[PDB]
Design a protein around this ligand. Structure first.
Ligand code: MYR
Ligand code: ZN
Lengths: 6, 293
């Protein structure tokens, strides 16, 4: 997976 | 229950028993604040008008960055610590390693202080990457640069380019839009089958998937939180999956020590008989760093 803020 | 009592004495006793051999540390920003490094997830910083960004958080997004890296490196300059001096809490983890107790440290931090304090690559899961190494953005070259090299380029406001191929060189942190390191999920699968104790320091456990790590512990595994605030409990504003239970009548394994991380680890160390060793270690390591600027 990818680094998301929201 | 493996803790005789739900206190620091109880945890210290359990640590010195034959039952406790493999310790996982989960750490966050609160272990580096006393080294003068701010929480890059809290209300530090806001005034990025300068950089002409499409939206605020574009400064830490990977697509933006590879297109316009100057903002990030200029902000890196503003935020760059004057010195990398690890704290008592970091040196505590080095003590664990020296005593044969450290299975792994999972860190949310990118400041390299774990490495400087003498944790090796093998001991660490940098869940969000690190500044300790940087690599050329060209997959074919992928040339590695130390932090010193990155420091210089940042503090001399000259963009980092590869010496071999002149590509951009990015610090090995996880920008937004990058994939979380595969090592995180790899190590989690393997490590939580062996853990006898979870030390949780300097994190409010708000960022996922790092927060979920506490649910990976076996039910019997004692869990100690050293932090300025209690954290990790079930959150009804989400659902209602085994959060921290410190204070209920069903509490059997979780302990919260409240204060500066530094003071927490000193207290745990004092109970273990390690305070002198820890003090001597910090002082000679600090002096060594102070001596090297
Ligand atoms: C993802 O959660 C990482 C967030 C990155 C924060 C911005 C980087 C700050 C740059 C300053 C470096 C100083 C410490 C080595
Ligand atoms: Zn290169």
């Amino acid at each position: 997976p990818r680094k998301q803020l929201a | 229950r493996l803790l005789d009592e739900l206190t620091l004495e109880g945890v210290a006793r359990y640590m010195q028993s034959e039952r406790c051999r493999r310790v996982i540390c989960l750490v966050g920003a609160g272990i580096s604040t006393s080294a003068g490094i701010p929480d890059f997830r809290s209300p530090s910083t806001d005034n990025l008008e300068k950089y002409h960004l499409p939206y605020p958080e574009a400064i830490f997004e990977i697509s933006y960055f590879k297109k316009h890296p100057e903002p990030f490196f200029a902000l890196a300059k503003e935020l760059y610590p004057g010195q990398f001096k690890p704290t008592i809490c970091h040196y505590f983890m080095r003590l664990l390693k020296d005593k044969g107790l450290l299975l792994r440290c999972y860190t949310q931090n990118i400041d390299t202080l774990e490495r400087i304090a003498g944790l090796e690559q093998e001991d660490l899961v940098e869940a969000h990457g690190t500044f300790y190494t940087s690599h050329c953005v060209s997959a074919s070259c992928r040339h590695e640069y130390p932090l010193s090299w990155m420091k210089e380029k940042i503090f001399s406001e000259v963009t980092p380019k590869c010496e071999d191929c002149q590509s951009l060189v990015k610090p090995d942190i996880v920008f937004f839009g990058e994939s979380l390191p595969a090592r995180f999920f790899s190590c989690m699968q393997s490590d939580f089958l062996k853990v006898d104790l979870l030390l949780v320091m300097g994190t409010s456990l708000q960022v996922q998937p790092f927060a979920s790590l506490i649910s990976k512990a076996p039910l019997s595994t004692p869990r100690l939180l050293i932090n300025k605030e209690k954290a990790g409990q079930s959150d009804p504003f989400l659902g209602m999956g085994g959060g921290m239970d410190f204070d209920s009548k069903k509490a059997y394994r979780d302990v919260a020590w409240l204060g500066e991380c530094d003071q927490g680890c000193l207290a745990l160390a004092e109970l273990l008989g390690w305070k002198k060793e820890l003090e001597d270690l910090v002082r000679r390591e600090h002096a060594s760093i102070d001596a090297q600027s």
